[PDB]
Design a protein around this ligand. Structure first.
Ligand code: AYX
Ligand code: ZN
Length: 257
């Protein structure tokens, strides 16, 4: 199956998922001088006070923290969005080196990592229905640069030893995702897709202008994870990012001036 190596990586995905070459693929480069300020964009409403985390999981492509989405507990609304989107999971994409690790780029600049907080539109009832809809998902993207540690990330870093290999999961209750957010909620937005197979074109992307800083020790522990499962030849989980895709007939809008 698909992965991020030479023989199964992003250049191969279109053979199993021809939408890889579609009209609204993600990620993209954010050209800040070409994105237009849109005064009609409302502020984002990130309501994570009641968030209920469940498990942390190595899925062989990233690690993921899942949340209870059976009620409106942690929701995203406002911004470019209509209606209510429930937080389902977050995961990261990161590099083998600090100069690469993000999927979106900003004026071609690559960040060391990128956080994706994945939400689905409650009008569609369940995630599986939502991924079949052009407005089914909203993913909040947050860039990571290497500098000072991010305290709200350390509980995640602390547990990665226990999910080293594909298929491992662990209890990860009572985690507060508000500690992963930067100060400003200024954002860029555009219509796009999942950045992993099936690459469904179901995502309103909301990418925050302000990166969070993480320490070298924190991102180092990302790079200790493995793509393989236990008892297999070790391949470090690094460079699990899809490169920027053609913007095609799309406008990136900015919530700020
Ligand atoms: N890398 S990304 O563009 O932010 C992305 C987000 C979501 C998916 N797909 C899913 O999350 N599917 C899914 C469907 C049901 C339940 C869960 N989950 O337990 O996290 C996940 C793929 C790529
Ligand atoms: Zn992602």
């Amino acid at each position: 199956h698909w992965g991020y190596g030479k023989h199964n990586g992003p250049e191969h995905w279109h053979k199993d998922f021809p939408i890889a070459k579609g009209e609204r693929q993600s990620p993209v480069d954010i050209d800040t001088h070409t994105a237009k300020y849109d005064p009609s964009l409302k502020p984002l409403s990130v309501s994570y006070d009641q968030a209920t985390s469940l498990r942390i999981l190595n899925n062989g492509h990233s690690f993921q923290v899942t949340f209870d989405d059976s009620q409106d507990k942690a929701v995203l609304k406002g911004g470019p969005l209509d209606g209510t989107y429930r937080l389902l999971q977050f995961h990261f994409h990161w590099g083998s080196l600090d100069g690469q690790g993000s999927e979106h780029t900003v004026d071609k600049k690559k960040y060391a990592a990128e956080l994706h907080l994945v939400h689905w539109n409650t009008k569609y009832g369940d995630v599986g229905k939502a991924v079949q809809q052009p407005d089914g998902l909203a993913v909040l993207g947050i860039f990571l640069k290497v500098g000072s540690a991010k305290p709200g990330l350390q509980k995640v870093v602390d547990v990665l030893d226990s999910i080293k290999t594909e298929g491992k999961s662990a209890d990860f209750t009572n985690f507060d995702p508000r500690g992963l957010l930067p100060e400003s909620l200024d954002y860029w937005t555009y219509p796009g897709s999942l950045t992993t197979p099936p690459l469904a074109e179901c995502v309103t992307w909301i990418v925050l202008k302000e990166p969070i800083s993480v320490s070298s020790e924190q991102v180092l522990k990302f790079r200790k994870l493995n793509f393989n499962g236990e008892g297999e030849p070790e391949e470090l989980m690094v460079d699990n990012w899809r490169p920027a895709q053609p913007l095609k007939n799309r406008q990136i809008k900015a919530s700020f001036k």
